[PDB]
Each structure stands twice: as structure tokens, then as C-alpha cells.
Amino acid sequence: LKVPPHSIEAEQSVLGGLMLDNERWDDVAERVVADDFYTRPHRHIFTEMARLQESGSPIDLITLAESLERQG
Amino acid sequence: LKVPPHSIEAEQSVLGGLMLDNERWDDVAERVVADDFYTRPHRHIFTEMARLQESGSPIDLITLAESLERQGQLDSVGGCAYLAELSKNTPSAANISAYADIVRERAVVREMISVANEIAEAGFDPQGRTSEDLLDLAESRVFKIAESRANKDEGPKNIADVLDATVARIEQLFQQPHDGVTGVNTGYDDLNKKTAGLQPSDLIIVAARPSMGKTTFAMNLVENAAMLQDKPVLIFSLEMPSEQIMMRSLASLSRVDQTKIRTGQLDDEDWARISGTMGILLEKRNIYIDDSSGLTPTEVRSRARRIAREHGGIGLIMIDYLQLMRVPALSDNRTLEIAEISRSLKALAKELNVPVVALSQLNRSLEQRADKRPVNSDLRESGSIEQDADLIMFIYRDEVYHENSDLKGIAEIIIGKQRNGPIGTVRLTFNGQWSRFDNYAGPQYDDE
Amino acid sequence: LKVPPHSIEAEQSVLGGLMLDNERWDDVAERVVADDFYTRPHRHIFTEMARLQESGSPIDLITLAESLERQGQLDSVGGCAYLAELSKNTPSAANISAYADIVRERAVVREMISVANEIAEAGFDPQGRTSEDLLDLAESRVFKIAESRANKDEGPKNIADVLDATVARIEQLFQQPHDGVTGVNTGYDDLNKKTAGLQPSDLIIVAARPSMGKTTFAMNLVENAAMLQDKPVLIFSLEMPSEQIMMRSLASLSRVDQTKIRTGQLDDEDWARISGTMGILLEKRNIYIDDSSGLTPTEVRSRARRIAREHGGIGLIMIDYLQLMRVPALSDNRTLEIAEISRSLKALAKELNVPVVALSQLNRSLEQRADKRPVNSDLRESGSIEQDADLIMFIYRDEVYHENSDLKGIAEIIIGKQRNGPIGTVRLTFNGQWSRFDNYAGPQYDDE
Amino acid sequence: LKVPPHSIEAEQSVLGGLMLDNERWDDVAERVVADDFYTRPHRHIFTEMARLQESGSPIDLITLAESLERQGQLDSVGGCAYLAELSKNTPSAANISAYADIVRERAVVREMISVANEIAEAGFDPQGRTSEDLLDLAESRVFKIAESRANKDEGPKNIADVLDATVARIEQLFQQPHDGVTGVNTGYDDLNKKTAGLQPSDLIIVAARPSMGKTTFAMNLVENAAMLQDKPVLIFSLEMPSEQIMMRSLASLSRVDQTKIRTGQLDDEDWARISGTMGILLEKRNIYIDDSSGLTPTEVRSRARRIAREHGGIGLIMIDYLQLMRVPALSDNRTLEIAEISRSLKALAKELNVPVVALSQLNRSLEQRADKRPVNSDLRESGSIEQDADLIMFIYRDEVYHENSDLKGIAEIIIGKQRNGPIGTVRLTFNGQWSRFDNYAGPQYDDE
DNA sequence: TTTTTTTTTTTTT
Numbered sequence A: 001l002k003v004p005p006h007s008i009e010a011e012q013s014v015l016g017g018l019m020l021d022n023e024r025w026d027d028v029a030e031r032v033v034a035d036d037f038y039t040r041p042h043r044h045i046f047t048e049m050a051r052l053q054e055s056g057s058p059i060d061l062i063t064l065a066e067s068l069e070r071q072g
Numbered sequence B, C, D: 001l002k003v004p005p006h007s008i009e010a011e012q013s014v015l016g017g018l019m020l021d022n023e024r025w026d027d028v029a030e031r032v033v034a035d036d037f038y039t040r041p042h043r044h045i046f047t048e049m050a051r052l053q054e055s056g057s058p059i060d061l062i063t064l065a066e067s068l069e070r071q072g073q074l075d076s077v078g079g080c081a082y083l084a085e086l087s088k089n090t091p092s093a094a095n096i097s098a099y100a101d102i103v104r105e106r107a108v109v110r111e112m113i114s115v116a117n118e119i120a121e122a123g124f125d126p127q128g129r130t131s132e133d134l135l136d137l138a139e140s141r142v143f144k145i146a147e148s149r150a151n152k153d154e155g156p157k158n159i160a161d162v163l164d165a166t167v168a169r170i171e172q173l174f175q176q177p178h179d180g181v182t183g184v185n186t187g188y189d190d191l192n193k194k195t196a197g198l199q200p201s202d203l204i205i206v207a208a209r210p211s212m213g214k215t216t217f218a219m220n221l222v223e224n225a226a227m228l229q230d231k232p233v234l235i236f237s238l239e240m241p242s243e244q245i246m247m248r249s250l251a252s253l254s255r256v257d258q259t260k261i262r263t264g265q266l267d268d269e270d271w272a273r274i275s276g277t278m279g280i281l282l283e284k285r286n287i288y289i290d291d292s293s294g295l296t297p298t299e300v301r302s303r304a305r306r307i308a309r310e311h312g313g314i315g316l317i318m319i320d321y322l323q324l325m326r327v328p329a330l331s332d333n334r335t336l337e338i339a340e341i342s343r344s345l346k347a348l349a350k351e352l353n354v355p356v357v358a359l360s361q362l363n364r365s366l367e368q369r370a371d372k373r374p375v376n377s378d379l380r381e382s383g384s385i386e387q388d389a390d391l392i393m394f395i396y397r398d399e400v401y402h403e404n405s406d407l408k409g410i411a412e413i414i415i416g417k418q419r420n421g422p423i424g425t426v427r428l429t430f431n432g433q434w435s436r437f438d439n440y441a442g443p444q445y446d447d448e
Numbered sequence E: 001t002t003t004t005t006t007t008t009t010t011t012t013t
Ligand SMILES: Nc1ncnc2c1ncn2[C@@H]1O[C@H](COP(=O)(O)OP(=O)(O)O)[C@@H](O)[C@H]1O
Pocket: B208, B209, B210, B211, B212, B213, B214, B215, B216, B217, B258, B259, B432, B433
């Protein structure tokens, strides 16, 4: 089982920073997309993050937790 | 087991936030109330908070703890540590609106779930109630749910409210003495008399046959808007590269034969003029160009939003042109695709409160007629282009069709539609060499 | 477990009665169906009985058993022995009707129980659904449940009652000393002669090409109706903001060129007239404006009923315009979507007993003819728009198409369809500056 | 084991009717012969009656038993007991026409099966026969079945018949017209000739564009049928309330301008006419009208059967209109939904033996052509409407499309299909004021 | 399977 090329640490840094700040969303929106993330959990979080952002709502742990909870 | 929905953390944040800043008290109070919480101690804290606010006492930890201790509810809700933890987990007070909005949503869902349980309880056991009564209770409960929302969806509005807003708008328009130009200045005084500028929230359209000056006129509008105000203007050039557009603009502003610019056979005076134009443009710096091809309506909206957010709003956006945009979801039916694009452009204008100037092409049926001036029903593939547009300007140069025309170098701006305003024709001198439309100083010919 | 209420005795008595006396099968069919039975074997037996009866085969203990064996359901239902026991249990079909109603009540109770269960699940597992989605779901389920109670009592039956009801209405109208007008007063004498006002329970339609004046005419009818009666009038402006609608209606009533109102260049006399209009509007307070975009037929019904309930009925409903309404279910077939919208609006008018005025657009095929007067088959996407409307009015302004036309500032209201009246043309004056249509007091031209 | 199709009841009913009435034996003999049955003893009986008719002896129980006893066939046919039973099965001798046709139809089907069996036999065992022999044998058999049917409208008339018809009709015309009609009266003499009335078990169709008199014509047929018979008539008005339908009927029967009735501006003379009409209608009391909306083929069948059983049969059924019925099961394919609806109506029509009139709409393609007269291909969603229809009438009014046409107030009924008789055009006068059609007494232009 | 809206080429009156 050859290891597919991926970097979890970079993904974790990107997801955490976006949680910290909202002004850089554009910086990452152009660069990466939901399909970019390797692990499905990260893919789910980014999709929820995008859904909140395009709704014009603040990004935070509580908002993300509820939004992910809504979709199960 | 099924746990009724609730957000303890959000309940913590809303309670925590107000203790720092009380200015957002109205925002939290109007949005949510103590009945929205799922945990009883939180309801007790908010009830105390509302009482303290009504008493004029500042909202803070010390005042809250004092009130709870005096009332004896401090033990029930915790204490100094518990209330300190309440504010500790708050991410930011500014976000409190979202936390309050979340709390409202959880309460609404709980209210709906309770109603569903009440409906199920009533249905399972008639308790002497007939079928019709059960329908009535369901209707009454549903109406209550739609009643407890407190609008939130812009339902029908009484006429008294509308009159108050409209008369206010007219009164403020009275004060500012603009004398004709309510919207963006077009730069051609004959055109301002009819359009009164490019009004915000409009979908303007410029249409003409190929090589009639459609991109030459639009760029003149963009140049005049940039120099006659201070807000950024955004250009989506899906047809030509950015370099070609700028080569024309230098020729227009500096009034230098664009053949020399494109070819490089420039003299000393031409260099002097171009240097003057460059200084002016770099002094303002409020023009943005995006020459990417085949953009979808979503990409157009996203990029416009970012420019507006960063630079404090937009003043005008131009699209060149409408039919080059793509909607991949609707690609089997070109008629539906064009209708979707037109609707999106109108929606974008409303959202940003900015005029959108989208160019368009024309059918070939115009060329089978004895009279070759355009009409509304010539717009290409135009299902709803004629219906959504609030203003339609056609460019017609008679010299193209009749060589011996008397109107040599006199273009006509035919206003084919204007929702709020008259229609007519405007004559402008066309200097193709400089890629420019100028005011027609000649004698005014009455329009029929 | 929560066993749903049921009465197998009524089902068994009905089944025995059908097998004994097949003549009373109508009594069962007019109260219950195959799916009303608590036990599935009863449902299979009823369905087989219906198939046999529809084929002319008698419903007895032999034919039903033979049919079940051929279809293979004889094993699932139990066999001939179960049918034999059902025959023994039921004495006679003398009281079959009472049992059928009980089974209908049980079937209804099972349905409302299921609806309550579904709603509870949705609240417990919204799966991301917003509060509105469940609200509309609750409304639809209530409407479906009440549907069985709408028309389930009587069918054709009497004619004597039809004559009694009809003659009574003629007497009421005869006694009432009205001047030909029986519906809402349009405000234009020539139009009242042909239409006799906007009749209740009708679907009126106004159509024309872009910028012909569909909204200008429609708002004039709204203003005249509001001033000439007391019941509220409701407006759905899916296209223009409420503010723009008010500016037009403020210019029409006060007769002030709307150019000044829009631009704010008003003198003292204009402010006097606008003040007079505001006084009159605020005295009545029976106009409601809703400018939400993209409303489904369900939302239109919900908001219309709420206004009627609060203010004791409606007098007129205006929609601007048909094609802008949405039906997400039928979002693939546009033709079916338009057909559904038209059917719903006609039903809404009948339900509330109030004329509904819905505007519409026209095809481009009109613009390829020598005679450019609209006809019924020009309505856009119009599957059943022509087939459902009770009255269709077209707006034609000749001066738009011929600059030399003698009819300058004259509009023709072409009545393209009317089920219960003549068709013809009515000529009015168009004052665009004021956004108004006026009676054509000038010389009258007989209509061929 | 596949049992060849047959109709035992038809055989028994035909035999009994012949025994009772002897003057109609010729009609039965021409339509069906002894060999056309399925059971040998019944064929023997028919041979006995044919022999008796050849000798001229009366045909009845006594004569039939005498002939059978003399020939020894009395025991073969079960004796005199079965001879009496044959008449006991027959309700009446007048209805022998339908039973004889069924016997002929089964005979044709049996012959087809035998030919198919012979075809399989030859193909399975060529015996040396070339493919040409097999094909020629098959072709000859097909022609025998097709040509061994008699009937009418089966080819070009020869010369001898034409000459006799020419001289015969020339002689008759200059003396008297000699109109036969001899059909289920529709009230219009010119229409009875081309249709022989509305024959039972058919599925008639009326089609036209919106607002063409489609409902006006159907109501006139229902009224005329009601007065000229005693059997009840039924109406399913899925579009207009019973009040509006009754208002039109009062205007039509009493010949009163229906605008006055709608607005109530009547006088003493008009009230006298209406009172007279109400007396006549209540005297008969044989019209039933249902205004339920969105019915299903099951619901109409149940209601129609109930009315028939209560009052002993239905003389006519009218539906307004076809496309408005609903079939929830097939609620995804409209084409299949309409196909099921049309099939169900035809099944009901033959099941009750009563004409069924169903209205239908038309496409918009009709208006595209230069000739706007409808054709059978214009029926809307016509998956199977044309196939099942036994008679199709289109309503046309040239005045609608041409103001200067000389056919003012003239409506053409275009028969686009018919089982028996020709297809042509029938002119009528359309008095819209009274919501009525009248016989075209004017110059009867020769139809080309 | 049916109804709708847009292009482009031919033939006729
Ligand atoms: N140097 C020049 N001299 C004269 N005419 C020119 C020159 N450069 C461009 N034009 C003219 O300007 C016209 C407008 O071009 P353009 O705006 O690209 O048309 P559109 O964008 O409507 O297709 C063209 O018809 C072209 O002939």
C-alpha cells in the first residue's frame, strides 16, 4: 500500500487559522477547495465552513459545531 | 433516546458577552428572550440580567452576582467561578449576534417539536374531540408558529409604513442640489437629461451590431465615471485582453491616434500627452480590470463582493459581454442559460446597490429590413433581456449602411427602453481614430 | 406500543355486506377506499372486489376467491376460509353505510397519526432543513388532511337545488340597485360597460410587450378599487421595490410628473398636491404591498389568507407577474411549472371569492407580423394561461410602432377573451409623465 | 389451454329475441348467420329458424319445438325447456342489434384465430410448398377476412348504383325533400344527417381553441337530448360552477340576452320567459350536474353507475373536460395519464351502453399555419385521444380570425372521424348573446 | 412522450 502524497499538518494549520480569522477566507478560497482536503472529516468541515461564509455569518467553533450537527 | 435541541455553549456566550459590553443589549434582547433557553439556570441568569438592565444597573459580573446572592439564586446558578466561566468561553462579544441568532433557532425548533408532540398527543387520544377539532388545533398551532416568528421574512407591509419611507427619500433628495444627476454622471450632458445618470440597482444594457462601437462607448462611460467620482469601478472584459483595453483608453484620454500607439510611431508631443494621462490615472487608482474568460455568474458575484468589501464599496461595474458568460448547470438549453444569467446580473445590482452595465449582441433579422435601427426584440437569444433591463441604449451609426449619408461621424444613442423615464434619441460625434464619443455640438435636431 | 385506533368489526361487516349485497357497493365506495382498512388482508380483499366489479363480475364468495387465487392473493388474505367467516359474521348489509363511515373515520385518524409521526421525526431530525421548510410542510399536511373534508358528501344529485340557488342569486342582484357594475369598480366607464367590474372568483390577466404599461395599468386598477370600496387590496410586487411602486402611485394620484418626484425637484404647488394625496391614503389604510421576490404558490396562499383573516376578507389581489413565481418541485419542466402556477391562482380566487389580477408577458412572434396587435396565443410559456383565465386584456399603444400614427397618446385595451361577456376594444388616454391612464373623453370611434 | 373467445349470453339473448319478434329476424340474419355462433346446438337452432323463414312459417316456441321434434333436434337442444329458457334470458327483442354485433365480432375473431392456426400449420410443415405459396396463401386468407365483412364505406361505388341514385334523387328532390334523420336526436336536423344522432357505446369528442363555443355547444346538446327523451342525463363540470352553467342554460332556453341575467337588469317580459323555462325543467327533472373539481376515472364511474341504478340507466353523459381529470398513480407521465383517462372513459361508455361526450383542447401549432381549421393531429397531449374516439367534432368560426370575413355569425362543425357514415362540414348560426347554436337556415352553400 | 423558446437555411404565394 504505497502512501498517497498528502500533508495532514498543512490541512490542520489551514483549518485552524480560518477558525481564528475570517479576513483570510479569500486567500484560501482561491487556493484550495473542499475536494483538496485528504481526510473526509476535513472535507466535511471545509464544506460547512464555506456554507457559513457564503451565508455571511461569523466563523467560530460554536457555529461550526451546530452547522455540522445540523447535517449529522 | 432523543435529546431536544439546544446550544449550551451559545447560551454561555450570549450570557458572557453582555457583561463586557452592554451596548449590544438591544440586539440580544430584541432577537431572543429568557424563554428561548433550554437550561433553567441560564433562564434565571438572563431574567436577573434583564431586571438589572431595567433598573439602570450596568450589566457586569459584580452586579449579576450581587443580584443573584440577594435573590438567593446564586447557589442555583453557581457562583463567582461559574459566572466567571460563563464569560471565559465567549469567543467574542461582537459575534454575540450569531450566538443570539443560534439561540433563537434552537428555541424555534424546540417550540416546533413541542407542538408536534402536542399534535401527536391530541391525535392519539381524541379526548372527545372530533376530527374537525383536531384540524382546527393543528391550524391554530401552525398559525401561532408563523405568528411567533415576528416577521423575519418581509411579509406584506401596510401602506402607512411605505409612505413614511418614500416621503423621507424624496425629502432628502430635495436637500442635495445635484440638479439632474441623481446617479453616476455619464459625462454627456445630453444623455444625463434623459437618464439622469446611471441609477443604482439598475441593469443597464448597451447593444449594437458588431463593430458599431459597443465596447468603445462602454469604456467611455467607465472613464467618465472614474474621473467624476471616488468609488472603484470594476471591468469584466471577457472578449479582449487587458492590454488592448488600456491601449484604447490611452488613445481616448490623451487624444492620440490609436494607430500610432498600437504601432509605436509616436512623436514627442504624443509622449507628452500619454505621460499626462498616466499621471492622472495613477493619482486616482480606482479602476480594476478582470480579463478572465467564460466566467460564471457565481464567480462574477464573488469577485465584485471582494472589491466592494476591501475598498468601501463599488461605484459601477461593466460586463463585456452578456452572452459570453456560462452557467454549466444549464448548458443543454441556451435560452434558459441566458435567462439565468440575466436574472443573476439583476440580483447582483440590487445586492450591492450599484449600476451594472452589461453589453449585448443583436440578431441578424435587423439586416433584412428596409430600416436598420435596432428595436427591443432584436437582442440575441433574448428571452428575458428585454424584460429584466431597466434601461436599453442602442448604438446606431448610419454612415455604416448608407455611404452618402448626411450623418457622417454622428452616432445615435437610441433609448429603446426606460422603466422610470422617457425614451428618445441622442446624437454624439464619433471619433473612431481616438476611440471616443464626443458631445454633438451641432444644431439640435428635434426627436420625433 | 401505541396501537392506532381501529374497528375491525366495521371492516368485516362491510366486507360481508359487499359479498352478500353487491348493490350497496356504492355506499362503501362513497365513504371508504381500499386503503382505509386497518388490516392489510381487508385492503387486498377490497381491491380485488373493485377489480371484479369494474369487470362486471359479481362480488361473491366464489368469484372473489377465484380472482384471488388467479392473482395469488388468496394465500395472503388467508384463503376461502377467511372469506367464508366474513360472510358468516356479517348478518346483512342493512347498516353497511354506518360501518363505512366508521372505517373512514379510522382511516382518517390513521392518516393524522402518521402526519404527526412524520412531523415529530422531522423536528427530531431536520437534516439541515430550515424552520420555514417544516412550517410549509405542516401547512401542506393540514391542507391535505382537510381535503377529504372539502368535497366528500354529495355529487351531482339534485337539479331542483340548482334552480333554487340560481334563481335566488338573480333575485338578489335584481333587487340591488346597482348601475350594471356587479364586481369591483374598475374606475373607467367604458371598461365597466364591457366587463361589469372585476367579478369575484375570477382570474383576470393583463398582458403586453415590455414597457407597454402592464404595471402602470394594473396599479391604476388597484388605486381605483381602494378608493371605491372598503375591503383591503393586496399587491405582490415580485419585480419592483415597494418604494418605486409608491412613487408612481404618488405621481398618478396627485398628477405630478414623476420625473420631479424621482429627482426631488419639487416646487411648492407639487408639495401641496403630494400632501393632499398622503392625507387620503392614510385615511383609508386598506392597501398592502409585498415586494418579496420569487414566491411559490403556497407562500402566496399563506399570506393572502392571513390578511383576509385579520381584516375580514380581501377585495382584490394583484400579482406582478406570473412568470416570476417558482415551483421548486417542477423546476425541470418550465411548461409544467407555468401550468401549475396558473391552476393554483385560479383555485386561490375561488377559495377566497376575490378577483385575482395577474400580469403576463408576450412572445416575440408578435413582432414578426405586419399587424402587431396581440392575440391569445402570444402569452409567454403559456401552456394553460389562455385556457384558465376568465378575462384577458391586452395593452396596445400604436405610437410605439409607427412614429407617424395619428393615435398619439392613445392606448387600446383589447379584450382577448371573456367567458361570460362580449369581446372588443376600449380606448384610453396614456399620460406617461404621471404614470396614468384616463378615460378617452375625446371623440369615440365605433369598434368593428 | 386457451379457450377461443365467444359470447354465450349474446347467443342466448339473440335466440330469444328472434323467438319473440320475427320481423327483425332479417336484420339479425344479415348481420350474423348460423355459423357465426360458438356452440353447435345454437348453430342448429339458427338453421331451424332460417328453414322456417324460408318456408315462411312463424318463428316462436311452438313452431321451433315442432320443427326440432320432427327433425329429432329437440333433444339435442335440451328440449322445450331450453327453448323457453332462451327467451327468458332475452330481456327484449329490440336490443337484439347489439347482441348480434357481438356475435358477429366473436365470429370474426374466431375466424381470424383459425386462419392464424392454419398459417402456423403450413409454416411448421412446408411439405415442399415454396415461400411464395405460403405468402400467397397468407395474403389470400387476410383478404378473405377483410372482405368477408360487408358493412359500408368499403370502396368506390360502381356505375350502375351511381346512375340509379342520380335519377332517383333527381326525381325525389323536385317533389319533396324526404329527410330521414332516424337517429338519437341532437336537436339540429343538419347534424343528424351526417351523424344519425349520438350512437350509444361511443366516445364522442369535441375540440376547439379557447373561447370557441366548446362548452356552449356541449350544453346545447345536453339540453336538446333532455327534452327529446326521458332517460336522465349527467354532467361533470370540472371548470365552471353549477350556477354559471345554469345561468347559461336559462339564457339559451328562454332566448334572453345573458348579460341581463348576469347583471340582473331584467324586466317583466324577460321574467315571464324565465318563469316559463323553469316550469318546463322542473316538469321533467331528469338532469343531474356535478361540479366537483379534479375527479378521477374511478370517481366518475362510481357516480355514473349509482345514478343509473337509482333511476334505471343514463341517456347521456357530458364531461368538461378531458384534460382536467387526474390519475394520481400515473402522475409523472402526462402522456400516460391522458392515455389512461381516455381508455377508462371508453370502457365506461360501453359498459353502461350510453354515449359519452368529452371535450378537449388543442395545441398552439394550429395558429401557426395559414389555414387555421383544426385537424386530428392538433389534439393536445394526444397520446391516444384520436385512437379511442369514435367521433370527433371540431368547432371553427372564421369571424374570430378575420373581421371582414363574410361568415359572420357562422360556425362550422368539422367531423374528423366516424365509425359509420361520411365526414364533412356542418354549418350553424352562433348566437353568442343567448349562448346558443341554431340551424343554418340561410343559403346552404355546397360543401367542397 | 409531450409542450415551449431561440437560431439558421431553403422553397413557395
Ligand atoms: N484607428 C481607427 N480608425 C478608424 N476607426 C477605428 C479605428 N480603430 C477602431 N475603429 C473602429 O471602431 C469601431 C468600434 O470597435 P468595437 O468597439 O470593438 O466594436 P464592438 O465592440 O461593438 O464589436 C470599429 O468598427 C472600428 O472600425
